[PDB]
Design a protein around this ligand. Structure first.
Ligand SMILES: Nc1ncnc2c1ncn2[C@@H]1O[C@H](COP(=O)(O)OP(=O)(O)OP(O)(O)=S)[C@@H](O)[C@H]1O
Ligand SMILES: Nc1ncnc2c1ncn2[C@@H]1O[C@H](COP(=O)(O)OP(=O)(O)OP(O)(O)=S)[C@@H](O)[C@H]1O
Ligand SMILES: Nc1ncnc2c1ncn2[C@@H]1O[C@H](COP(=O)(O)OP(=O)(O)OP(O)(O)=S)[C@@H](O)[C@H]1O
Ligand SMILES: [Mg+2]
Ligand SMILES: [Mg+2]
Ligand SMILES: [Mg+2]
Lengths: 318, 327, 330, 257, 332
DNA sequence: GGCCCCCCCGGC
């Protein structure tokens, strides 16, 4: 009862660039670079769980073959990446003499580079510039604005897009066929709808289902995976009448265990990204939501405050 | 940047500009010919517009795109330009100029520059944007005024929103450290007040003057505290009361008799100083506080130099009591 | 602990030790039991409000997985401990990358109350979680999801703990009565559930207070009056009378009735406002602005009360707000 | 008093306390008639320290009933530092004690220092973790082990130990390079203290952290020889024998993947 | 003693001297024989007897000998940051209980746990508060927590859920008259009928203020040296209560409706030093209790008074707020 | 190797 089974996220983690779905142009470009060699400095940006770390790892593995152990230097947020580390260990790795095939180069993979300090990024500039004939740099980040401009200038840009429904669905069919999982169309649609483009969350939900209920359907997925609360908040904020909004808040948000602070924050974000509403009305609703948030942060996290905020928003939009 | 201040007048300053689209056309065409990929000249400028003067970035872009796409024409220039757009945080002056523009707040502009974009623009520099907005929101010609609304009403609404944002900021930097309210401060301090007076600037953009005023007020408060604690043993009042009530009466005894008796009032002034444990530096600080029609700079300057020299000699030729020891 | 478990508070005395003693979370309990019965245990994120039983559930799961000697085979870190970037970098990484000591098994890390952790630590934990997944599993317990980074949320399977249902609270109350040899009137039970708001800690605390209040628990039955006296909460009849007087009677008699009701048992104004809000939420109003005014003015009054001030003025304001809001009905 | 333990020299207890203070924080002592035992688990739950001191290490020892004492090693070390290195140290405890009394007495003078440390409520068991039949055992001088550990920790943070036919290998793989040290058992009849002994049942290959080994070798001042016992699917044992007791470090090997 | 204020001299020493907090005092007394005291959260208005109650409970539980070694008290006058909570409170809670002496075990129950009293808990930051959630639960068997606050909303939800809540009711003339009368007899203070009731009504749930007013009145009577009984007019004067005549003039000026006259009268009135809160309370009483005004007037004036009180509670200028309130009332 | 001290972010 102590022998853990490898999760499908790691068990079915792609090992070749042909198993990565989405961002077709970038994947083919990476495959062509790996085939032809001469990998340039690159920065890959995108939202979590879309296949950036997997892409860079597969590229490095395919490029370096058996020399992966001695030709790859991987550093992430869980390791010390201070200015001294950049100044000593990275420089030593770049200056290292390693015999490689004619079309290959040493690779430094600085994952989650958005958390690095400014000093390390500044010090890395000439390190990449001088030793570009032996070592190449591949950064993986979630926010591209956290990387200093000089580093972006010295590196190519690869902005990963959001995984389409078709790609996630195809990967789901492939993994289900490999695992021989009994499924229904509605269950897969619900899983993809709840994933919101996050492949990792989709895999986790697909495993939890079948791992807990056997067969995949809408009810089985929904009894363990809840619908994203941002959609419920948007529905509440767009209610035609105050009664409907109050009912939605009471039934789907307050009685389901969601905290008031989370509700007000989600309302703030949704109002921030409501295109259908006019900008001035959105600003007034943002002001009211900020007043409610300030009241909640002071200690009064009561449903009365949320109801009053909804009533004021309805009055403003009338 | 302030770190470069020491290098102000010790080196020959050489400034490099962003190369024009015509100074690199030949080099880029030569590179395209050498690498055997077609590069349409008519779309070259946009590439620089995409890279914004970065020859290294455009060279890297060409190298990456030529890996699988051997033709660079108008059919795919838009996609690569959108995908390779460089994002650089705007400076406070640029932030103020862009945020106070009425185009982005229109129905058509809002769909291009959204509320999230404005919040990100504020967050590019969150320590200066509210000050610049508060300073430069009175020098615009609004174009988004509501039918029947006047400029003054919009200014008043913006000022009220700025006050609310100031309250929010004070709550943010309290002992609780409620930084999660920073996005709200973006709307109440910069976005909303600018949305009511957005338009075209009526003049040059001026940097916020609140910092210098705050420093001057802090220095004045320090001098007032020094004077108050120097005269504490004699007076029964606080520094506020000393400034509001005592200082004019003191001027009536420490500056007025120099303008009537000439150099014969030195003894009385010295006696007053001894009675209230005042010094010459305290005299200068006190005479520098007055404002309005009671400015003393011109009056002090017009005093004959002989009188001032005699007063200084008399002050330095005798011992004076000290109120506070080892200040 | 000291002496015996009888000296412990009821909140801690009745802490579940196994998974079958957790009530109101049948779906989650069954899912975790199935996960631990066949070896497929993923990373867990228990999100829920206070008093739902997340800590008890994870403790029971750890005990079932490992056994009696579970404290020495798991790494439990909470807000009471220092959890910084250095701690995550060194201690958590060593625990995840090292084999067991006492007996063979996988490594379990329980980051209780992880919502109070810095963003740097959460960012660092991503690769620690994704690298030692083969031999280590992570469980994170949270009350506010907005404090967790999206990257951390993506790597964990989410389980939501709903407020305790009525039947679960009744079953726990019956068990507590059997253990403590106590009798509870049905109306007292309904009042306890109504005031509980889905928190079992409140149930246990109020029940202990009521037991202490009884002159002799051996042959005394707790009634709604006992619960109201212990908690000081207004009775439903008092709330109904106050609302009736405010709605139909004039100013002077309404003020007199409110003062008399408050002074009879030393009731607090905030509880009266809350009860009036609950009662009026079920009123079939014919207009919307009346409800808008009621909600806004009552929220303003509650916010003012939270900061203190004159109580008589606040009560008069409540009466005036209710009267003005209901005037719009016509 | 109920429990009264008299030490020949305060340094005797001070050296053992200093031998494992830098790897664990909270300690639990069980005092009985046979002697004093203690087990401490570090925060990372990787290293376990087990100390036993017999009655032969005490001048006068009396313990009517078992006593459980929870202490903070930092506080105990501070109090021991407050005491001198030439006075007699006495451990004093009473029934259900809320504190432990350390008595420092000087024979030359009439100065008596009585320090009281408030005890700690640490409810835990010992579990007597010790594998009956280890795969391999070896014994070698402590100085050589400390030198090898310090040399191989300068190259990398991980050290791999391999036990095979008539040979022990320590390997470190790092960024600047790698290092290997191979030692073969031999017996010397003129300096027996410098001999190295090895008895193996199956070949072993186990990886350990460099920091834990560095902290373990700090107990080289309590003994001249160290016994290292390795076994698959079992923590590695590092034993330093004392005058009448012993000290043991149980270190869990790193996961192999 | 004679060198202490009456508020401190007559501070309760045991649990039997608490007057109007029986709903919690009974539970606390029962815990003496039950020995299962839970974590407590004492909340209520100022001057209700929370710190006194907890001190009396600790005394009756441990004794003057074990009080020092079994109680750890932290208030707003000590640093209570997150680091302090994580280190000092954790260390004290995890410590073993001090060994009682046979004397204490003979004459006192000596419960097998210690008490940490976090007075003025409403001033602690949320981050610091969050660090105690597991500290209270893990060491509940050796330590118990008492959190005393005036605003219950300032305590985070998890701590309120963990703690057993105890509300202290306001001390009015209907439940605290006995203690004030006993204090008066002990001090041999002679007062006219209804004087103590007037004092308690003016106090409005604050027995400390009532005791201070009684002490001031007794001092004034002793200095007078006439032997006459203390009247209610002198008590009202000592309490800063505006005379009824001034209130009558104020309401007449408000009824006049002229802005200039109201402003001039307010300017003259503010030179006497009357507190704005007392004026607002008296105006509210007079207007609400009067039967010469219609429903709408009272409906508007209640909200106006509430807004004025809320603004004054934030520490603003009294002159401007009073003038604005009077102007608004005059236009009703 | 360990304190002690100074500068700098802090939303998505
Ligand atoms: N394009 C993809 N195709 C197939 N599986 C994917 C893909 N992207 C993600 N996954 C799956 O999700 C798992 C995690 O993918 P990741 O590489 O960790 O995503 P990520 O974008 O690098 O996450 P961040 O930004 O570091 S938090 C993979 O092992 C895959 O099993
Ligand atoms: N499902 C439950 N069944 C029985 N008792 C419960 C249950 N949930 C909570 N309790 C009781 O309330 C006490 C506290 O439960 P907890 O496990 O601490 O709740 P919690 O969700 O961990 O609180 P938070 O989210 O950390 S503030 C338990 O000892 C139980 O006595
Ligand atoms: N229930 C009471 N019984 C007798 N005297 C009381 C009572 N409450 C307050 N007092 C008296 O008023 C004095 C002060 O009481 P406190 O204990 O300070 O009230 P408090 O609740 O602690 O006020 P806060 O909320 O900390 S400002 C006591 O010394 C008593 O003399
Ligand atoms: Mg990744
Ligand atoms: Mg918990
Ligand atoms: Mg008090």
């Amino acid at each position: 009862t102590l022998s853990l089974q490898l999760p499908w996220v790691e068990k079915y983690r792609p090992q070749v660039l042909s198993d990565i779905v989405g961002n077709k142009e970038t994947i083919d470009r990476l495959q062509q670079i790996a085939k032809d060699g001469n990998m340039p400095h690159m920065i890959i940006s995108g939202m979590p769980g879309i296949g950036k770390t997997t892409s860079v790892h597969c590229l490095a593995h395919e490029l370096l073959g058996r020399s992966y152990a001695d030709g790859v230097l991987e550093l992430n947020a869980s390791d010390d990446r201070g200015i001294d580390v950049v100044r000593n260990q990275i420089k030593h790795f770049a200056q290292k003499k390693l015999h490689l095939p004619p079309g290959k180069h040493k690779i430094v993979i600085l994952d989650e580079a958005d958390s690095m300090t400014a000093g390390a990024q500044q010090a890395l500039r000439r390190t990449m510039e001088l030793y570009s004939n032996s070592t190449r740099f591949a950064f993986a980040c979630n926010q591209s604005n956290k990387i200093i401009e000089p580093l972006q200038s010295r590196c190519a840009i690869l902005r990963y897009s959001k995984l389409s429904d078709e790609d996630v669905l195809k990967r789901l069919l492939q993994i289900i066929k490999l695992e021989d999982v009994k499924y229904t169309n509605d269950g897969l649609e619900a899983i993809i709808f709840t994933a919101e483009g996050d492949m990792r969350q989709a895999i986790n939900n697909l495993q939890s289902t079948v791992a807990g209920h056997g067969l995949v359907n809408a009810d089985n997925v929904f009894k363990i995976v809840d619908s994203p609360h941002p959609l419920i908040v948007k529905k509440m904020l767009l209610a035609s009448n105050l009664e409907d909004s109050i009912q939605i808040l009471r039934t789907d948000l307050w009685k389901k265990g969601y905290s008031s602070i989370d509700i007000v924050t989600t309302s703030f974000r949704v109002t921030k990204n409501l295109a259908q509403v006019k900008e001035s009305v959105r600003l007034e609703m943002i002001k009211e939501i900020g007043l409610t948030h300030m009241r909640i942060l002071e200690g009064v996290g009561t449903y009365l405050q949320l109801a009053s905020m909804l009533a004021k928003i309805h009055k403003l939009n009338n | 940047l302030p770190k470069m201040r020491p290098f102000d007048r010790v080196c020959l300053d050489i400034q490099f500009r962003r190369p024009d689209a015509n100074s690199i056309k030949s080099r880029l065409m030569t590179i395209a010919i050498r690498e055997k990929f077609k590069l349409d000249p008519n779309v070259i400028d946009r590439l620089i517009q995409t890279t914004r003067g970065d020859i290294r970035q455009v060279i890297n872009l060409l190298s990456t795109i030529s890996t699988t796409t051997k033709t660079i024409n108008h059919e795919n220039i838009n996609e690569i330009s959108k995908a390779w757009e460089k994002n650089i945080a705007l400076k406070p002056f640029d932030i103020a100029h862009k945020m106070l523009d009425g185009q982005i707040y229109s129905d058509i502009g809002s769909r291009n520059f959204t509320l999230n974009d404005k919040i990100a623009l504020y967050f590019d520099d969150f320590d200066f944007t509210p000050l610049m907005i508060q300073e430069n929101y009175l020098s615009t010609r609004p174009s988004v005024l509501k039918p029947g609304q006047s400029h003054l009403e919009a200014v008043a609404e913006a000022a009220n929103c700025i006050s609310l944002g100031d309250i929010v900021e004070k709550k943010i930097r309290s002992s609780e450290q409620l930084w999660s309210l920073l996005p709200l401060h973006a709307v109440l301090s910069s976005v909303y007040p600018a949305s009511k007076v957005a338009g075209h600037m009526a003049g040059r953009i001026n940097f916020t003057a609140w910092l210098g005023q705050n420093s001057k007020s802090a220095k004045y408060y320090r001098l007032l505290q020094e004077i108050h604690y120097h005269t504490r043993l004699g007076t029964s009042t606080d520094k506020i009361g000393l400034r509001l009530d005592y200082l004019p009466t003191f001027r009536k005894r420490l500056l007025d008799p120099f303008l009537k008796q000439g150099a014969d009032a030195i003894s009385s002034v010295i006696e007053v100083m001894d009675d209230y444990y005042l010094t010459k530096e305290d005299w200068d600080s006190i005479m520098e506080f007055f404002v309005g029609p009671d400015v003393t700079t011109a009056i002090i300057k017009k005093i004959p130099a002989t009188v001032k020299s005699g007063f200084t000699r008399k002050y330095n030729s005798m011992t004076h009591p000290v109120a506070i020891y080892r200040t | 602990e000291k002496r015996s478990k009888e000296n412990l508070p009821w909140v801690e005395k009745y802490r579940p030790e196994t998974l079958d003693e957790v009530y109101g979370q049948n779906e989650v309990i069954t899912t975790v039991r199935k996960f631990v019965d066949e070896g497929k245990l993923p990373h867990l994120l228990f999100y829920g409000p206070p008093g739902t039983g997340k800590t008890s559930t994870i403790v029971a799961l750890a005990r079932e997985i490992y056994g009696k000697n579970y404290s020495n085979m798991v790494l439990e870190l909470n807000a009471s401990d220092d959890r910084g970037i250095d701690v995550v970098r060194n201690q958590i990484k060593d625990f995840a990358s090292t084999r067991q000591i006492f007996s063979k098994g996988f490594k379990l890390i329980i980051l209780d109350e992880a919502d109070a952790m810095t963003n740097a630590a959460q960012n660092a934990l991503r690769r620690v979680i994704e690298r030692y997944t083969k031999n280590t599993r992570f469980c994170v317990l949270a009350n506010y999801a907005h404090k967790l980074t999206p990257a951390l949320l993506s790597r964990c399977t989410r389980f939501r703990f709903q407020p305790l249902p009525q039947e679960a609270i009744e079953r726990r109350i019956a068990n507590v009565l059997v253990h403590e040899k106590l009798k509870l009137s049905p109306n007292a039970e309904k009042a306890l559930i109504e005031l509980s708001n889905g928190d079992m800690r409140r149930v246990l605390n109020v029940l202990q207070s009521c037991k202490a209040t009884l002159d002799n628990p051996d042959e005394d039955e707790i009634s709604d009056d006992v619960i109201y006296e212990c908690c000081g909460a207004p009775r439903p009849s008092d709330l109904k009378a106050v609302l009736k007087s405010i709605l139909e009677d004039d100013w002077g008699t309404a003020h007199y009735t409110l003062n008399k009701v408050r002074s009879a048992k030393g009731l607090a104004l905030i509880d009266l406002i809350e009860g009036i809000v609950k009662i009026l939420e079920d009123y079939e109003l014919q207009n919307e602005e009346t409800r808008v005014h009621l909600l806004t003015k009552l929220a303003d009054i509650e916010y003012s009360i939270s900061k203190g001030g004159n109580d008589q003025i606040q009560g008069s304001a409540v009466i005036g707000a209710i009267k003005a809001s209901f005037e719009n009905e016509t | 008093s109920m429990l009264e333990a008299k030490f020949e020299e305060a340094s005797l207890f001070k050296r053992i306390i200093d031998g494992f203070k830098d790897c664990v924080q909270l300690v639990n002592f069980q005092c009985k008639e046979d002697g004093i035992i203690a087990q401490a688990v570090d925060d990372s739950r990787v290293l376990l320290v087990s100390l036993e001191i017999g009655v032969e290490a005490f001048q006068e020892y009396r313990c009517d009933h078992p006593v459980t004492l929870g202490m903070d090693l930092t506080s105990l070390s501070k109090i021991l530092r407050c005491g001198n290195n030439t006075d007699t140290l006495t451990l004093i405890a009473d029934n259900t004690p809320d504190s432990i009394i350390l008595l420092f007495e000087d024979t030359k003078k009439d100065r008596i220092a009585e320090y009281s440390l408030k005890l700690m409520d640490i409810d835990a068991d010992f579990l007597k973790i010790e594998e009956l039949q280890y795969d391999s055992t070896l014994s070698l001088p402590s100085s050589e082990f400390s030198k090898i550990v310090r040399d191989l920790s300068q190259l990398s943070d991980s050290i791999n130990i391999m036990i095979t036919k008539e040979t022990i290998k320590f390997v470190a793989d790092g960024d600047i390079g790698s290092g290997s040290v191979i030692i073969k058992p031999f017996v010397d009849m003129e300096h027996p203290e410098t001999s190295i002994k090895l008895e193996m049942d199956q070949p072993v290959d186990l990886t350990f952290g460099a920091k834990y080994l560095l902290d373990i070798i700090k107990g080289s001042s309590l003994s001249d020889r160290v016994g290292i016992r390795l076994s698959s699917e079992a923590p590695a044992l590092f034993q330093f024998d004392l005058k009448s007791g012993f000290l043991q470090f149980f270190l869990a090997p790193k996961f192999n993947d | 003693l004679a060198q202490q204020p009456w508020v401190e001299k007559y501070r309760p020493k045991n649990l039997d001297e608490v007057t109007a907090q029986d709903h919690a005092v009974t539970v606390l007394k029962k815990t003496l024989k039950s020995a299962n005291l839970p974590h407590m959260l004492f909340y209520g208005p100022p001057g209700t007897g929370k710190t006194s109650t907890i001190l009396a409970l600790t005394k009756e539980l441990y004794g003057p000998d074990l009080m020092k070694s079994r109680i750890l008290e932290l208030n707003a006058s000590d640093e209570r940051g997150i680091s302090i909570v994580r280190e000092k409170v954790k260390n004290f809670a995890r410590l073993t209980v001090s060994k009682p002496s046979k004397h204490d075990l003979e004459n006192y129950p000596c419960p097998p746990y210690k008490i940490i009293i976090l007075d003025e808990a409403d001033s602690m930051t949320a981050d610091a508060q969050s660090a105690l959630r597991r500290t209270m639960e893990t060491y509940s068997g050796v330590t118990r927590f008492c959190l005393i606050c005036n605003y219950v909303t300032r305590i985070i939800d998890p701590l309120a859920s963990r703690c057993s809540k105890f509300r202290f009711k306001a001390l009015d003339a209907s439940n605290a008259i006995d203690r004030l009368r006993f204090i008066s007899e002990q001090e041999n203070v002679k007062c006219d009928d209804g004087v103590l009731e007037r004092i308690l009504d003016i106090s409005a749930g604050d027995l400390r203020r009532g005791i201070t007013l009684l002490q001031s009145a007794s001092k004034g009577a002793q200095y007078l040296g006439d032997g006459k009984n203390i009247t209610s007019t002198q008590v009202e004067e000592l309490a800063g209560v505006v005379p009824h005549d001034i209130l009558i003039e104020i309401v007449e000026k408000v009824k006049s409706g002229d802005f200039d006259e109201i402003k001039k009268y307010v300017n003259t009135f503010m030179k006497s030093g009357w507190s704005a809160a007392s004026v607002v309370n008296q105006l509210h009483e007079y207007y609400i209790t009067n039967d010469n005004f219609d429903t709408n007037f009272k409906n508007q004036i209640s909200w106006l008074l509430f807004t004025t009180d809320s603004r004054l509670n934030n520490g603003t200028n009294e002159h401007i707020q009073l003038l604005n309130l009077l102007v608004k009332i005059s236009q009703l």
